[PDB]
Amino acid sequence: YMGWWGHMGSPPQKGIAGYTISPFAARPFAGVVHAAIFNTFRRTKNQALFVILPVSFFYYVWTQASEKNEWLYTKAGRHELAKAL
């Protein structure tokens, strides 16, 4: 499923003209400030839910479990611990 240079396995290409300029002719950091602020904001905003929802859920689960465990091993939690074992 992959060939090599000259016969890579692409369907025939026709009609596309491609253009680019030398690395010495270009500013490598052109538009960096706009990218760093606005592009990163767009990309992050669009993926935020997929990180926030599972992280926040599993952190809540952990927080509740760790707080209960801590409470069960206090004086106040003696009776509830006795039942739990």
Binding site: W5, G6, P12, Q13, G15, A17, G18, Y19, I21, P23
Partner: protein, 438 residues
């Protein structure tokens, strides 16, 4: 020793230049103009080429049909071409048909109708030419090469111009172009073959005396181009042959390195598998390419303009899995112009060029083209003695010094057309412009 090129002026500033050959019976007279597409802006780009089509479509005296008949009756033919910096209109005839031909040329240049009906008719013919250059692969490659090397500059524009301009060119724009540009101080009347100079000067006084002079007469061949290292890829897997051009910014007509660049170009040279002698050529690139079947052909070039040039190579190949090798070995031969060339290669190339620059001038049309080109680019015809002296002045040190400033580690413009999947990206090509071992 060839006969001396005679040169005279008129009062308006029209140059007449002639070189007689009493052994031939035919003559080429014509007008070389120091003007071309480069003189257009973006809005009237295409005008100069448009005019060339209309110059043959009838004048104030002769209709299109009468024009046809008049030339047919002469016996010879007329020809024209427009380039970026030069326009030519010439007539090949019999010895004694020269006064007719000068008269017809003077007519079509000064007194052309440019009738709205003919503008409208050619507007379709030219539109069809846009879709048929597509076949002339070398021209496609070189036009993309200029477009990218001189990105957004006048030298980068096509001669035909965009489709949009073709639909909007008026007789007004045509008239304005030829009134501003086709002035006497930018024109040379050239005769070669069976022409008498004194006869030609009289014919010039008869037909070209009422030519406008420009307000500010600069010398002939008077011009800032900023080369862009870049690439155009026009991949077409259905084509069997890849066409590739690689160029760097080269030298103008009047550069001090003009001959050094020609010698360097001759060290790489040309190659064509279809010519029998090409397998035995001395050029190292020729030997690599022929032994390994890397290409069908290659042609080194050193194109000059008034204020810049392109120096490089044009390759054609069916070997689509070894395009990388072809490009690699070509650029490693260029590296050697900086690192390795000695008097061996330099003196061999000078020998070959000393003849080559003379041999090219065969028939009357080649001689006329040589007088016309030299007069419109340098302001004078350079004698073979001067040319022999300038070539002799090129040393190996000059070649190495030129290559180190022009080729070594420099940006290239690169155009690839056809099955070019194997042509690597810009960086890997441009990395071959130097050698890490040196």
């Amino acid at each position: 020793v060839s006969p001396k090129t005679r040169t005279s002026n008129l009062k308006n500033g029209l140059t007449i230049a002639s070189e007689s050959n009493p052994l031939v019976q035919t003559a080429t007279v014509g007008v070389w103009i120091d003007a071309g597409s480069r003189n257009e802006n973006a809005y009237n780009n295409g005008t100069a080429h448009f005019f060339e089509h209309l110059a043959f479509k009838g004048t104030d005296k002769r209709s299109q049909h009468q024009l046809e008949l008049d030339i047919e009756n002469m016996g010879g033919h007329l020809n024209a071409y427009t380039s970026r910096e030069s326009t030519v209109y010439y007539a090949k005839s019999f010895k004694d048909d020269v006064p007719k031909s000068v008269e017809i040329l003077a007519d079509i240049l000064q007194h052309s109708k440019l009738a709205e009906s003919a503008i409208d008719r050619e507007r379709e013919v030219i539109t069809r030419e846009l879709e048929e250059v597509n076949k002339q692969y070398e021209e496609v490659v070189f036009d993309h090469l200029h477009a990218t090397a001189f990105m957004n500059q006048p030298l980068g524009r096509t001669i035909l111009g965009p489709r949009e301009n073709i639909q909007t060119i008026t007789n007004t724009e045509l008239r304005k172009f030829i009134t501003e540009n086709y002035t006497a101080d930018r024109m040379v009347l050239v005769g070669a073959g069976a022409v008498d100079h004194d006869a030609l000067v009289e014919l010039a006084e008869k037909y070209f005396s009422h030519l406008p002079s420009s307000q500010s007469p600069v010398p002939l061949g008077t011009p800032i181009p900023n080369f862009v290292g870049s690439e155009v890829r026009l991949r077409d897997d259905t084509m069997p042959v890849a066409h590739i051009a690689i160029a760097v910014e080269g030298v103008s007509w009047t550069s001090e390195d003009y001959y050094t660049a020609l010698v360097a170009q001759a060290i790489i040279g040309n190659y064509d598998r279809a010519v029998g002698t090409s397998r035995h050529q001395g050029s190292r690139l020729s030997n690599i390419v022929s032994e390994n079947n890397l290409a069908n052909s290659f042609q080194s070039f050193s194109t000059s303009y008034s204020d810049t040039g392109l120096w490089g190579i044009y390759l054609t190949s069916e070997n689509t899995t070894q395009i990388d090798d072809l490009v690699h070995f070509t650029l490693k031969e260029w590296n050697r112009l900086s690192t390795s060339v000695s008097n061996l290669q330099v003196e061999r190339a000078k020998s070959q060029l000393k003849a080559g620059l003379l041999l090219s001038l065969d028939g009357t049309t080649y001689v006329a083209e040589d007088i016309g080109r030299q007069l419109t680019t340098l302001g004078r015809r350079v004698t073979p003695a001067e040319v022999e002296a300038k070539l002799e002045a090129v040393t190996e040190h000059d070649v190495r010094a030129w290559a180190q400033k022009t080729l070594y580690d420099k940006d290239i413009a690169l155009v690839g057309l056809g099955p070019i999947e194997g042509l690597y990206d810009y960086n890997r090509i441009r990395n071959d412009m130097s050698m890490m071992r040196w």
